[PDB]
Write a protein that binds this ligand. Structure first.
Ligand SMILES: OC[C@H]1O[C@@H](O)[C@@H](O)[C@@H](O)[C@@H]1O
Ligand SMILES: OC[C@H]1O[C@@H](O)[C@@H](O)[C@@H](O)[C@@H]1O
Ligand SMILES: [Cl-]
Ligand SMILES: [Cl-]
Ligand code: NA
Ligand code: NA
Lengths: 118, 118
């Protein structure tokens, strides 16, 4: 769930989730346009992942609690049987790791209303 | 913001926000397919409204705090000047009222992974 994703974010990286509340065209809620950079592409992918999670029975991305461990900076998704849990933990882990490895361009904070995301 | 939306939901209607968390193809996070009914239709519109809110400078639909009053069952958006605030309060108020007036089809809880949301 979302609380687990937040913790994964600071497990794998230096910046916490609040850092990605308003970034580029896709970090945070919804979004449109072309992801402006690597980080924004991370968010773009996560969004789609969550939206695909719905196609799984009894699976709501924001509230589904999965099993995972953090051995800072390593995240491990434990689920195998519970497909919804496993799929969503993967969405979140992938994003958390993507955020950590991607550069954070301060120039791209607050651009969603600009020509960039059109 | 989201906490305000949740309170508007119970201001305007009898059901609270949790009964919408997993309804149809669009209530709750993202979604796809055709909205199955009136209520789902409410959620579909609200999702898009939030999407558009992002096209506004310094506007994040989930954390943006606006001004509103509840005189159960009436919701009033007070903002005029703060365009982001006013827009978002409108999205939420519209959704809150829509939810209240729409029938709730228990048959449509948990269908997002079924042919229905295809
Ligand atoms: O995708 C992230 C976005 O999804 C929503 O459904 C919520 O949970 C929000 O808190 C969050 O900002
Ligand atoms: O990350 C936000 C996610 O929220 C949903 O409610 C819809 O807005 C989707 O279009 C969007 O991808
Ligand atoms: Cl397992
Ligand atoms: Cl005002
Ligand atoms: Na997004
Ligand atoms: Na939705």
């Amino acid at each position: 769930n979302l609380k687990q994703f937040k913790n994964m974010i600071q497990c794998a990286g230096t910046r916490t989730w609040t850092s990605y509340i308003g970034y580029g065209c896709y970090c945070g809620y919804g979004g449109s346009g072309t992801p402006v950079d690597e980080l924004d592409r991370c968010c773009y992918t996560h969004d789609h992942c969550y939206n695909k999670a719905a196609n799984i029975p009894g699976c709501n991305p924001l509230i589904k609690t999965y099993s995972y461990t953090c051995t800072k900076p390593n995240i491990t998704c434990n689920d195998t049987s519970d497909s919804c849990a496993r799929f969503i933990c993967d969405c979140d882990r992938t994003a958390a790791i993507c955020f950590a490895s991607a550069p954070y361009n301060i120039n791209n904070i607050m651009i969603s209303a600009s020509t960039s995301c059109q």
